[PDB]
Design a protein around this ligand. Structure first.
Ligand SMILES: C[C@H](CCC(=O)NCCC[N+](C)(C)CCCS(=O)(=O)[O-])[C@H]1CC[C@H]2[C@@H]3[C@H](O)C[C@@H]4C[C@H](O)CC[C@]4(C)[C@H]3C[C@H](O)[C@]12C
Ligand SMILES: C[C@H](CCC(=O)NCCC[N+](C)(C)CCCS(=O)(=O)[O-])[C@H]1CC[C@H]2[C@@H]3[C@H](O)C[C@@H]4C[C@H](O)CC[C@]4(C)[C@H]3C[C@H](O)[C@]12C
Ligand SMILES: C[C@H](CCC(=O)NCCC[N+](C)(C)CCCS(=O)(=O)[O-])[C@H]1CC[C@H]2[C@@H]3[C@H](O)C[C@@H]4C[C@H](O)CC[C@]4(C)[C@H]3C[C@H](O)[C@]12C
Ligand SMILES: C[C@H](CCC(=O)NCCC[N+](C)(C)CCCS(=O)(=O)[O-])[C@H]1CC[C@H]2[C@@H]3[C@H](O)C[C@@H]4C[C@H](O)CC[C@]4(C)[C@H]3C[C@H](O)[C@]12C
Ligand SMILES: C[C@H](CCC(=O)NCCC[N+](C)(C)CCCS(=O)(=O)[O-])[C@H]1CC[C@H]2[C@@H]3[C@H](O)C[C@@H]4C[C@H](O)CC[C@]4(C)[C@H]3C[C@H](O)[C@]12C
Ligand SMILES: Nc1ncnc2c1ncn2[C@@H]1O[C@H](CSCC[C@H](N)C(=O)O)[C@@H](O)[C@H]1O
Ligand SMILES: O=C(O)[C@@H]1CSCN1
Ligand code: SF4
Ligand code: FES
Ligand SMILES: [Cl-]
Ligand SMILES: [Cl-]
Ligand SMILES: [S]
Length: 347
């Protein structure tokens, strides 16, 4: 099909494997621009002009897992490890709420020390502040997820990474796609707003794999979808692999918006790392969420899933103001409420 025909099928919601594969394979500038315009318009119509701010506190870079892509993998001895105290985390969340954040995201490596009860205690304290709490702590037993939901957690981010089970097991040798999916299903069952998503440009990942990632996301109707490029880290086995392409990754975000029109979709920091101004582009191609870094010094610079991350050299409190300026210069509005998913039931 020509680009014009692919676009027409996307506009009529004929989301076949073939339409998605062709959308990802056509490299014509005119087609891509039209795809991005469509996704921007769908975003505007379904989720409006509010860009929701999720302040992220990366509270520990200790991890028990050994994912091949990740700078926090347990085999990386060239990394100073750190843990914020529970008091530090609560007070740092309070400062973000003082700065206007309406969601606090707590993210870490899979660090056993906190699990499950110290997390529960932190969540209960933050919930007193009248904001949404999102956890992004990795894979844990059902019982831990249940405890955190009873403590008041609202949302959980657990990117599926890659929907190719073979590639998933190779890159994540401690676990499996089946396990990852079972965690996501358990989180949904428990009443979390649940986020999935994937990296683009992983070694060995194909276009057909990206199509499978889109169809997976569409299948499960996730509340949130986090997408970014793979960025190689020098202290990992994938150090010499190519970085994911920004344009391809942006097309994944655009297609995700077209597929899941009422979902919450961040403009990720990895997008702003590989291209200067990449978050702002992504916010104009389907995204409607931003996650300003709220990790304090001196830890911020130690939380390096990938290198060269933007924002690391800035003062503690810079990123909330910075994203508020971004949202204004984009002609957008800050979120007025917690920014939970507002489902638009259709046919
Ligand atoms: C319209 C003006 C002035 C051209 C001129 O000097 N008259 C020119 C000068 C620099 C050009 C941009 C850059 O090239 C970067 C980028 C390349 C992509 O391919 C297409 C998009 C983009 C954003 C370009 C758009 C446009 O084309 C610009 C703004
Ligand atoms: C800003 C640049 C360069 C534009 C440019 O420089 N040309 C425009 C100003 C031309 N003027 C109208 C002021 C004067 C014309 C008379 S003149 O005689 O001066 O040329 C234009 C050229 C292509 C545009 C992107 C694509 O669409 C894809 C996508 C659609 C989304 O929905 C919004 C996001 C995104 C990324 C777009 C953003 C932006 O919009 C771009 C980069
Ligand atoms: C934290 C300190 C000290 C006072 C304090 O502890 N303030 C708690 C405010 C709590 N809220 C955010 C929920 C108020 C919402 C009011 S609002 O009327 O916006 O709905 C206060 C004093 C001045 C405040 C900044 C300025 O103002 C400019 C700007 C306005 C944006 O908007 C949000 C960002 C920013 C940078 C502000 C952040 C923060 O706030 C500051 C630093
Ligand atoms: C100028 C930088 C390269 C910086 C560097 O040199 N490194 C390159 C890398 C990725 C490029 C964008 C993407 O392609 C998506 C989109 C395609 C549209 O067609 C035109 C607009 C837009 C936003 C592109 C503009 C520009 O071309 C970018 C920012
Ligand atoms: C304090 C720093 C500098 C500046 C830079 C951009 C500014 C924001 C934007 O202007 C949009 C918005 C307009 C409303 O009027 C009041 C609220 C808000 C969020 C502004 C607050 C504050 O003023 C900001 C953060
Ligand atoms: N090298 C790299 N490049 C780009 N993104 C990466 C990366 N290493 C990790 N990430 C991404 O960062 C996300 C958060 S990792 C932190 C939370 C948790 N340990 C977890 O694994 O879910 C991952 O889901 C992955 O998609
Ligand atoms: O892009 C990033 O850096 C982070 C990783 S998971 C949330 N976004
Ligand atoms: S991706 Fe998450 S689980 Fe895997 S090594 Fe990094 S921090 Fe640990
Ligand atoms: S969002 Fe971090 S300094 Fe701009
Ligand atoms: Cl969130
Ligand atoms: Cl994300
Ligand atoms: S900023």
């Amino acid at each position: 099909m020509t680009g014009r025909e692919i676009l027409e099928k996307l506009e009529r919601r004929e989301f076949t494997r073939e339409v998605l594969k062709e959308a990802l394979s056509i490299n014509d500038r005119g087609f891509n621009e039209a795809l991005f315009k469509l996704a921007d318009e769908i975003r505007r119509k379904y989720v409006g002009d509010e860009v929701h701010i999720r302040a992220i506190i990366e509270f520990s870079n200790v991890c028990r897992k050994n994912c091949l892509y990740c700078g926090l993998r347990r085999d990386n001895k060239n990394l100073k490890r750190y843990r914020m105290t529970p008091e530090e985390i609560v007070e740092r969340a309070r400062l973000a709420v003082q700065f206007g954040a309406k969601t606090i995201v707590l993210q870490s490596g899979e660090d056993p020390y906190x699990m499950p009860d110290v997390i529960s205690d932190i969540v209960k304290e933050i919930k007193k502040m009248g904001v949404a709490v999102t956890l992004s702590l990795g894979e844990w037993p059902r019982e831990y997820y249940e405890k955190w939901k009873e403590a008041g957690a609202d949302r959980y981010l657990l990117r599926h990474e890659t929907a190719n089970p073979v590639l998933h097991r190779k890159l994540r040798p401690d676990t499996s796609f089946e396990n990852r999916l079972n965690c996501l299903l358990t989180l949904k069952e428990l009443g979390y707003e649940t986020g999935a998503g994937s990296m683009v440009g992983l070694p060995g990942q194909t276009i057909d794999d990206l199509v499978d990632d889109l169809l997976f996301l569409k299948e499960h109707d996730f509340d949130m979808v986090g997408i970014g490029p793979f960025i190689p880290h020098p202290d990992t086995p994938l150090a010499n692999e190519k970085k994911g392409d920004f344009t391809l990754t942006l097309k994944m975000v655009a297609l995700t918006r077209i597929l899941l029109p009422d979902s919450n979709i961040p403009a990720t920091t990895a997008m702003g790392t590989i291209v200067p101004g990449g978050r702002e582009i992504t916010l104009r191609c389907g995204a409607n969420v931003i996650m300003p870094n709220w990790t304090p010094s001196p830890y911020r610079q130690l939380y390096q899933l990938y290198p060269g991350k933007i924002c690391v050299f800035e003062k503690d409190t810079a990123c909330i103001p910075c994203v508020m300026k971004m949202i204004e210069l984009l002609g957008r509005k800050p979120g007025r409420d917690w920014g939970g998913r507002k489902r638009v039931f259709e046919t």
